[PDB]
Design a binder for this molecule. Sequence first.
Ligand SMILES: Nc1ncnc2c1ncn2[C@@H]1O[C@H](COP(=O)(O)OP(=O)(O)O)[C@@H](O)[C@H]1O
Lengths: 801, 223
Amino acid sequence: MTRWVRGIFEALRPLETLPVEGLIRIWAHEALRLFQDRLVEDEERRWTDENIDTVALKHFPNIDREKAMSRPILYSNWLSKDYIPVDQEELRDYVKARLKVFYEEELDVPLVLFNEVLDHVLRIDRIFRQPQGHLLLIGVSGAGKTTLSRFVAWMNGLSVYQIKVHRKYTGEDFDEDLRTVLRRSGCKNEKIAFIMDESNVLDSGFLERMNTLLANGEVPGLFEGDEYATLMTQCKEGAQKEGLMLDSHEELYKWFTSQVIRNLHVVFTMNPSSEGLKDRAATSPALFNRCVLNWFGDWSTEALYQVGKEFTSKMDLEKPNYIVPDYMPVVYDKLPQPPSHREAIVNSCVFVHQTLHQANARLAKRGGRTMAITPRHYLDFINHYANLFHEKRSELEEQQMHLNVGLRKIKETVDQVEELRRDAKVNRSTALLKSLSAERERWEKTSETFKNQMSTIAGDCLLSAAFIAYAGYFDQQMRQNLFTTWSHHLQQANIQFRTDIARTEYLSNADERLRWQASSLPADDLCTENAIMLKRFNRYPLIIDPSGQATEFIMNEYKDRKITRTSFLDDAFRKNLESALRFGNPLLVQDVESYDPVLNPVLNREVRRTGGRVLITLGDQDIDLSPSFVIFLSTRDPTVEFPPDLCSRVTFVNFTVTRSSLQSQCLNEVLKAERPDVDEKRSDLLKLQGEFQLRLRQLEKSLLQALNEVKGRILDDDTIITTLENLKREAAEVTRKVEETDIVMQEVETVSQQYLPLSTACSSIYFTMESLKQIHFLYQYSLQFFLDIYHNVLYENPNLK
Amino acid sequence: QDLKGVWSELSKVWEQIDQMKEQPWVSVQPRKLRQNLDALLNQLKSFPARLRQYASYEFVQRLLKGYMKINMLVIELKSEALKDRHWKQLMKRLHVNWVVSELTLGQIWDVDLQKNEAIVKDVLLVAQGEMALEEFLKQIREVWNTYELDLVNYQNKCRLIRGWDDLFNKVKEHINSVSAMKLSPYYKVFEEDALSWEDKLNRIMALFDVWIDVQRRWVYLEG
Ligand SMILES: Nc1ncnc2c1ncn2[C@@H]1O[C@H](COP(=O)(O)OP(=O)(O)O)[C@@H](O)[C@H]1O
């Protein structure tokens, strides 16, 4: 309340004539900025918001409450001066201009200006423009804590300075860092933004010195001995610069203290955690008394919608034939009515984010293990969406161009064969002409199919990106549930996507799968999907596996690129890192549960491109970076819980076998070893989604290449039509497969349903054997053991003969 | 007439283009170049639509648009990692004959950077790798030309040496790094320097491994 009075007085000082409405407005603004700032959930936020007006109206009647309080309450001195209240849109335009200037200055990554981000920027700016204006941020990782703090510090001229933590980060290094920052702040009168994360705050040794620095205004005893004398010598120079000649050591020392208090703002960024925050309060009271609290957690639906809208400007997604569905599935209440395709797709993306929130909450309620979901995952998902959309559209356009070139070549060859007919040979020429015309009709049909795929591409890409980016940590059953929910939502919005889309086929091709199978990769569907995830990633993947097949597979895959092994526990970890980041080779890393926060710059992908050299800052040492560097983090323990900061910087690849994954594996093995015809029909059904199409395209490309060598010699026997008869029979086969796909899926479903109980029994038996360890330490069994029994049952069984 | 006026405006724009293309590439500032390009954009957009519909104006506008979209190509090229071996190599690939001392932005702007983006990016990545290796060599040179033994008195009878662990870790790190230098095919540059550093580091390793044993045995027997 004394800070309330201080803020009101500061607001009132430049102004000389105010109606009661302005005074009540300033009072309400300070109430918003002091009380509701530290609130966490939404219910108490609305409670405080309504009780402010309740109190204001009850204690101040006869005043127009419309002007006295406006719902978008905002105060700043950026527009004009004297802390005049400003409207949302004018300050939005100003911050857009200043953030553009920032873009040209640093941090080229774009930012999206919703209401929450602008409110946080205003709050941080208000806190900075205050003596001893220390600040603490509590909000989910990736909500925009460090980014906004840096932006506001730069806009104020406050030079940012953050400490990089690593292993064996002794207290002496932190003391030296404080000595440096104090010298830069107080002695040279350079304002410093001192931004600390939670990784280096975990140790309580630094927290006591930080406590004293926050409370007293400066820690006693950080400078002692010769360094104390150097501080005195430089403080004499500082006092000389200010024309405040002082000689006695204590006098200039307290002047240095005043300079530090006036020219040092500390910003803390803590990941919200009730027990962690309670521990922080236990070890230090200054983080809640001398430090003002700002809370902002998950982005609101409006923020997510606007971020998606701005990040989805570049790709086309204009579909003029799109019709607004009746009962549009809407998670954003301000969605335009009627919406076009782009609004629908961005709303669908927001729905995907929200439904993964819901799925994680439901799984937590069930009692399972949950990984935190952050807006960084949303940004990675939108990046995956853009990348996959661009790649698939480019591939389809190239294929269409190739088809057009082939059609023109065929036209030229028909004209040439007509000219050669102008002059039993004539019968063969007529047969060739008829065959070429039939092939032309096949070309037109393939063009129609290409247009259909161009229609489908948007929804197919959305689902593919949503699966590859968000999911991965959950089991096969949960992944299928999420994919089905997303498909159902897209069906509600009439977004064109293939109903029988297969994730494995759409996001790869034949040769990549063959290469993976060449290495130690089982043909399990979960393994294929997670290999898909391993191939495409923006954040460096985190691999969990109780079996260890992952390490061998990824070692074999990158063996040609001199990949090497390193764990966290060894003392060679840092040097192996530096080697990997400087010489440009992949570095598989194991035992991630003992995570080293030194990887934070690596995972963040925050590089500095200055002076003809890219630099990545590992600890206190600047290291050059090589573009051909991919890092993979691995662990054997599957039930370990990760801090959400790491959870928001890596994508999860899960290899733990579950009651649904093992059931599917056993069922597939039963189909393969018991009904080979059903298995091969299922494989043909799976390969129909492009692989047959790709083989047909390659074969017709070979036909075009052979036809390029014509020179009149194409009429050697006047029947080169044997190759095109091969193409025609292949096309007839694939057309028959497409036509009868319904009976094929029906019979596959029936056979799979018939064979399901054996797979369920296999899963139950294996999990009982795994759980036999609790009865006695002796009863230990592996998955390979159960597979050995499984093979001894399926094959080399005398009874089945 | 209108054609004469648009021809005069085109001549003025071409003269400005020539004028700032006369700036040598050594003295060209990428940020100021981008600002000048944006200023020309504003000047061209100030022309009336009747003058803007002319084919020559559209050609110059799209040429400048190519210039801005390759401005980031120029920024990457305007580094210090290019050295001159990479520049000579890209001379050889692009089959263009220029003078390093007389190099200006005009000739490189005549060469289609957009058509040769793959080659330019490959050369840039090669330059970054070679600069990284040379920077590590500079770092190891500065840390081994400044490293000092942590001498300390011992019973006022001698001045022994401590800090064996940190020195051993440093030497092991450097020798592992120099052994890893043999891969990463960018190693085909600066070979004799790497071999000399590896040899001297192995000499340091052997000498100090013998030295620590001598020291411990001597102090034990002295006691
Ligand atoms: N309004 C926004 N628009 C676009 N991207 C944003 C926005 N806010 C944050 N981001 C992105 O999210 C990330 C936020 O990181 P941040 O939360 O500052 O890290 P930390 O959690 O360690 O403080 C940044 O990398 C930034 O690129």
